[PDB]
Design a protein around this ligand. Sequence first.
Ligand SMILES: Cc1cc2c3c(c1C)C(C)(C)CC=[N+]3c1c([nH]c(=O)[nH]c1=O)N2C[C@H](O)[C@H](O)[C@H](O)COP(=O)(O)O
Ligand SMILES: Cc1cc2c3c(c1C)C(C)(C)CC=[N+]3c1c([nH]c(=O)[nH]c1=O)N2C[C@H](O)[C@H](O)[C@H](O)COP(=O)(O)O
Ligand SMILES: [Ca+2]
Ligand SMILES: [Ca+2]
Ligand SMILES: [K+]
Ligand SMILES: [K+]
Ligand SMILES: [Mn+2]
Ligand SMILES: [Mn+2]
Lengths: 428, 427
Amino acid sequence: SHSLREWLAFLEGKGKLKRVRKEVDPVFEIAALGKQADGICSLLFERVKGYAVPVVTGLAGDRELFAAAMSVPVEGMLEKLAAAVENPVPCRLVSPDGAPVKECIIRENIDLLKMLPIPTHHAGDAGPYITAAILIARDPDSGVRNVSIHRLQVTGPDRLGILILPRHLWHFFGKAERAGRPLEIALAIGVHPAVLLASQATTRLGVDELEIASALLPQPLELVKCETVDVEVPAGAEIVIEGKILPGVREVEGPFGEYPRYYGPAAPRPVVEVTAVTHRRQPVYHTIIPASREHLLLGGIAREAVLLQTVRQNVPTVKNVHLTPGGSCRYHAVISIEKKHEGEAKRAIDAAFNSSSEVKHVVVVDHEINIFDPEEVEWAVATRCQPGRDVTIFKDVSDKMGIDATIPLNFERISIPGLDKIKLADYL
Amino acid sequence: SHSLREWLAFLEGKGKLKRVRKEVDPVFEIAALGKQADGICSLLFERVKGYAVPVVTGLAGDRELFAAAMSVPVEGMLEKLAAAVENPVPCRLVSPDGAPVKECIIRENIDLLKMLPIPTHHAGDAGPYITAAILIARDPDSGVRNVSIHRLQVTGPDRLGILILPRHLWHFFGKAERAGRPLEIALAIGVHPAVLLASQATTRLGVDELEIASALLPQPLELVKCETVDVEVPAGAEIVIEGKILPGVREVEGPFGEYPRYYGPAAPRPVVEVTAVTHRRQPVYHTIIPASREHLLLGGIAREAVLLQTVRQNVPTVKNVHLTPGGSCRYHAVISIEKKHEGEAKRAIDAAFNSSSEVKHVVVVDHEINIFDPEEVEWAVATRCQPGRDVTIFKVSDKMGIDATIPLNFERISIPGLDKIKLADYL
Ligand SMILES: Cc1cc2c3c(c1C)C(C)(C)CC=[N+]3c1c([nH]c(=O)[nH]c1=O)N2C[C@H](O)[C@H](O)[C@H](O)COP(=O)(O)O
Ligand SMILES: Cc1cc2c3c(c1C)C(C)(C)CC=[N+]3c1c([nH]c(=O)[nH]c1=O)N2C[C@H](O)[C@H](O)[C@H](O)COP(=O)(O)O
Ligand SMILES: [Ca+2]
Ligand SMILES: [Ca+2]
Ligand SMILES: [K+]
Ligand SMILES: [K+]
Ligand SMILES: [Mn+2]
Ligand SMILES: [Mn+2]
């Protein structure tokens, strides 16, 4: 119930899952074929050289599918996401007996690369990477639960290197290693997209992203206890890897192809020792190809929800916001307003820059411009921006720019009568 | 030989011409159906309500077809066009006997709307407009020949309103009206796309765009004398309308749906009296739908050729230029350079702004960015522009330059085998 498998069923019946029955190499070929499907359809690789386990990529690659994953029309997606962040819903603990992720359990002679078709994605990558695992951990002093997604380099049979940015997991790990103790974690792979989307919520220090996922789903998310660590994982996941981040240890992780289409450099980083693996009988392995639409939209939609709220606080006339793919759904923002007073553009711009330190470039347009169409936003810039009046620059870590491409308060688009009414097919 | 009719044959055998056998109204419906084919294929309307004459639109709607019209691959289009501008080739004057455009000649009781299926394109338009006529005229003092395309409002049986922007024809007409004389002109409709493309060259004051067209074609363009005016027109055109712009007369022309997807406002403007119409037996009438890909690329390609040359003068490391469709193939420029020294971005920007008054926004990127892909240019701006260092603003329109090149002293991620492996062969 609201598992990856049901999501794959939903995609199949919509003709947005295609299978690939011919054998593929997990080294580069999965990523290469996945890139050609980016944004059009999900691919299920039924034969991966060296493995009985299939690989799925591109579960959702456009805003219509993420809206479907949340049971909303596109129009309501951002508000539904912000409502889930504001009002989390408890998860239900469930028995391990009959939980699909407990069907097979491995505690000895663990070899991750032997069990799982973990791909190698881009040319410069140090080796195979796990890119779609939600990482569940608890604060070792306050006990609160956090979920985030981290790249994990497969460095041995039972060892992973992990990039941890200075956010919540880092805070937890900091506390474990001041006490000289490991931090217990669980990794879950093959979950519903709503759960992945929930793992990208940026919140204050103590809100459990699994509870956010619970609010987005039709029923509460069902959890089960791990075998070897005191952590909870989604009962319906495909695969769970249990382990611990080792105190003090630093090993070289990287380099790795990342979201902005550049390499993340190699450096000494924490290490996870894996103490168990559990999975469904005949699991599906999910990978996210870095810088794909799936990768960009996961974080993007979450950042857009926050951006809409921040901008709406200061500019109640805001109709919509979009973090463009060109900007890695992060650096570039387009904001539509139903403008009433001159001065609204500047306020929307100032608000976008407080949404996150990442936003670098902001364009503001009138409500009738479709901000999801780059050609129409460019047209609005071309015809409605006078740069001496309409451009502000922030100099001083990143420079930033704001562009007011709204019509001044005191421009009708040309059209052809009959164009909705008449179809070229009926005349040929 | 290198007529509109041969061009339509070339499009048919490439599956890029579709015929429309059902009757269509020239008022709005041609434009509406044409807009749905914009950029996919040319349409020949075989039955236009009220007329024996068919209408063709969208002769070329992409850079591949304009390259074919010039007998070049896309990669060489801009250089081939600039070479033709630099080295024009004389036209051949030819006898009126046997010239196809002389087959039928009308000198009396001329009613343009009765003879020709002249469309009404957009809702706000003042009436039917001729949008694909090349206008040939000579300087009444220096005698040099010019070609340009002007919208012509059909205002009576033998009368047209004309928008003339302050460029070469304006200069000529200025001189005719200080002498109190009309300016004799000819309008040709239904020509090969190379000729239309040549009419959009922006040159210094005395180079004959018909000679540019001659250089682009496989053999020199054949011209013939007009019946009632001292002007030359293409022998192979479908239709020629002869006449004169009247000295002093000003009548309201407009409004009209234009290139940037806004209405051009109504105002008092010059007027053409028509003194004759000649055509092929059973002519085809060509219309250009305003703001279509055909409209935008005709002007765009010509402005890109000139822009590449101007920028190359000061920045020999320039690889390519693109005027984006977002900017109406006019306002927004993307310039790729193989950068050697810091400072090349600023020089490319400063040169683009002197190329033409119209360019408003310039982005400079490294040679490996595909400048025809807006998402990849945006990505370059997102990752390689620091606006405190990389944005210059010039203060009629303000202008902005963006340097989105890598600073000199950033590898793009990639997947081995991606050219070699095809999704269709695996599913
Ligand atoms: C969706 C997604 C998010 C990644 C991510 C990727 C994906 C697909 C990759 C797997 C393909 C590779 C890089 N990732 C990392 C990352 N954060 C981090 O600290 N280390 C990472 O390696 N991020 C961002 C991180 O998951 C989010 O910013 C979290 O919301 C942080 O959560 P928190 O606020 O609870 O700490
Ligand atoms: C291709 C094209 C070019 C038009 C044009 C259109 C087309 C389809 C229209 C017909 C559909 C609507 C508006 N047009 C006009 C126009 N120039 C002008 O002075 N008045 C106009 O009405 N332009 C631009 C003009 O033809 C070019 O700038 C010439 O190169 C100017 O030539 P010149 O340098 O010899 O003066
Ligand atoms: Ca503005
Ligand atoms: Ca730069
Ligand atoms: K999170
Ligand atoms: K011209
Ligand atoms: Mn958190
Ligand atoms: Mn000229």
